[PDB]
C-alpha cells in the first residue's frame, strides 16, 4: 500500500568520495577533514594478500605511493597510518564539504544506506540491512570496493560500514570505519565462507506493525515461550531490549508487543494461504522498528 524502502539522501556522502590508487590497485576512499579512509588492502596486489604481513607491507610504502583523486583535483598525501583494517591517509587539504559525522558500529538487523561508487564516482544508493551472518548480497557492490554505508539523523552522517571484498559466492564483506571486520572475515586470500543466515525477528514484527497501520489485520504471551518457538524456524532471538524498541509501534497501534509475537507464532506454521501482507507474500525483515515509525 505504498510502504516503501527509503534511502538516505546521499549528497553529504557524495561530497566525500575520492579515488585512491596505490600501484595497480584503485578503489574508493572517504575524505573527511584532512584524512582519507580506505581499505588497507589498497597497498596490496592480489598476490600480496596470499600471506600478507600488513605492517611489513606498509613499511615499504611512502606517501608518494598513494594517489588521491577528488574529482578533477589530486590531493597530496602527507601522512599514512593503519588503524585495524582501514588505512588513514592524511592529506594537505581539509575537505570543505565535510559534514557533521561520526563513526558507529552497528548490529545485525540494523539498516543503512550504501552509496555504491566506481573508482570515486557515485553510481547508486541502496537501502541495506546488516544480515545476521554479517554479509551483503547483490551485484551492486561488485567493482565498488571501499564504498561506505551510513545513516543520516538531523543532517549528521553516522558512517557504519566500508566495503572491502566480494567472496566467491557473490556476497560482500566489510568493516566499520575503525577497521574491524563485521563477522569472521579477513583481508587475505583464503577460504572464509559466510555462516548460515537467519531471519531478523524484531524486524519482522516491525513489518507486521506496519502491516496493521495500513489496514492488514488478520492475525505465547511470554517472551520466553515465543523465543522457544522462534528458535525453531531459523529466526533470531527476541531480547527484552527488542520488546522495548517495539514500544513506540505498540503504543501507536495499541497492540501489545507480546500480542504481536503471538500473531507471528502461527504465521510460520500454517503458510502463505495465498494471501498478501503489504503487497508481499513473504515476511519482510529488512525494516527496523525505527524505519517503520520513520515512515508511519
Amino acid at each position, epitope marked *: 500500500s505504498g510502504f516503501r524502502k527509503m534511502a538516505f539522501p546521499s549528497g553529504k556522502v557524495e561530497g566525500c568520495m575520492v579515488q585512491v590508487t596505490c600501484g595497480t590497485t584503485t578503489l574508493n576512499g572517504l575524505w573527511l577533514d584532512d584524512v582519507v579512509y580506505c581499505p588497507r588492502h589498497v597497498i596490496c596486489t*592480489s598476490e600480496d594478500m596470499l600471506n600478507p604481513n600488513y605492517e611489513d607491507l606498509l613499511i615499504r610504502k611512502s606517501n608518494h605511493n598513494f594517489l588521491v583523486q577528488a574529482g578533477n583535483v589530486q590531493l597530496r598525501v602527507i601522512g599514512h597510518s593503519m588503524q585495524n583494517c582501514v588505512l588513514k591517509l592524511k592529506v594537505d587539504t581539509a575537505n570543505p564539504k565535510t559534514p557533521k559525522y561520526k563513526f558507529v558500529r552497528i548490529q545485525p538487523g540494523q539498516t543503512f544506506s550504501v552509496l555504491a561508487c566506481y573508482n570515486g564516482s557515485p553510481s547508486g544508493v541502496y537501502q541495506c540491512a546488516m544480515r545476521p551472518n554479517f554479509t551483503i548480497k547483490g551485484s551492486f557492490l561488485n567493482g565498488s570496493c571501499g564504498s561506505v554505508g551510513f545513516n543520516i539523523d538531523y543532517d549528521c552522517v553516522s558512517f557504519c560500514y566500508m566495503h572491502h571484498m566480494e567472496l*566467491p559466492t557473490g556476497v560482500h564483506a566489510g568493516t566499520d570505519l575503525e577497521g574491524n571486520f563485521y563477522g569472521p572475515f579477513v583481508d587475505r586470500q*583464503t577460504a572464509q565462507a559466510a555462516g548460515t543466515d537467519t531471519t531478523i525477528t524484531v524486524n519482522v514484527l516491525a513489518w507486521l506493525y506496519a502491516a496493521v497501520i495500513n489496514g492488514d489485520r488478520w492475525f505465547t504471551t511470554t517472551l520466553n515461550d515465543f523465543n522457544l518457538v522462534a528458535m525453531k524456524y531459523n529466526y533470531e532471538p527476541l531480547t527484552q531490549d527488542h520488546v522495548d524498541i517495539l514500544g513506540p509501534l505498540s503504543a501507536q497501534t495499541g497492540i501489545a508487543v507480546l500480542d504481536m509475537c503471538a500473531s507471528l507464532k502461527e504465521l510460520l506454521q500454517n503458510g502463505m494461504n495465498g494471501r498478501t501482507i503489504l503487497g508481499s507474500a513473504l515476511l519482510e525483515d529488512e525494516f527496523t522498528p525505527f524505519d517503520v515509525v520513520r515512515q508511519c
Partner: nanobody
Framework: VQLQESGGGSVAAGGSLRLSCAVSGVTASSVYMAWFRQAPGKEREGLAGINTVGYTTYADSVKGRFTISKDNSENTLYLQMNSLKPEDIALYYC??????????????????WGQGTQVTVSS
C-alpha cells in the same frame, strides 16, 4: 591452489576448441574462476568468469561464441570456444581467486594462474 590448462591447438577460422583447466590443491567449488588470454604483446584480457553459485560474466569480445562451465565433480573448468577468428590467437590462461575487489574479469582480482595453453587460428 594449482591450475593446469589443456585443450589448446591449431584450427582454421570458424573452427572450435574446448579448453580444460584442472584444479588441484583446493576444491573448484571454493574459488571464483575465470578464463583469460594473453594475445601477443597484449595485457591479459578477462574473457569469462563464474562464481561459486553459477553466476557468469562474459567479455563483449567473446559473447555468443565462448561458454564457460564448471564440473565440480571433476574439479575442472571448461571454455567452449566456437567461431574462432585470427583475433583470438593467444595463450589462454585459467585463473582463480578467493576474493574480488575489482570488476570481475579484471586480472587484478586473481593471484592464482595456470601456465597457459596455446590457441592458433589460421585465416
Amino acid at each position: 591452489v594449482q591450475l593446469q590448462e589443456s585443450g589448446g591447438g591449431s584450427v582454421a577460422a570458424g573452427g572450435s576448441l574446448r579448453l580444460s583447466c584442472a584444479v588441484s590443491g583446493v576444491t573448484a567449488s571454493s574459488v571464483y574462476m575465470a578464463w583469460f588470454r594473453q594475445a601477443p604483446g597484449k595485457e591479459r584480457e578477462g574473457l569469462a568468469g563464474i562464481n561459486t553459485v553459477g553466476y557468469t560474466t562474459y567479455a563483449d569480445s567473446v559473447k555468443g561464441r565462448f561458454t564457460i562451465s564448471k564440473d565440480n565433480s571433476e574439479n575442472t573448468l571448461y571454455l567452449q570456444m566456437n567461431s574462432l577468428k585470427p583475433e583470438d590467437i593467444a595463450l589462454y590462461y585459467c585463473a582463480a581467486t578467493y576474493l574480488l575487489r575489482f570488476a570481475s574479469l579484471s586480472a587484478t582480482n586473481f593471484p592464482y594462474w595456470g601456465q597457459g595453453t596455446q590457441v592458433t587460428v589460421s585465416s
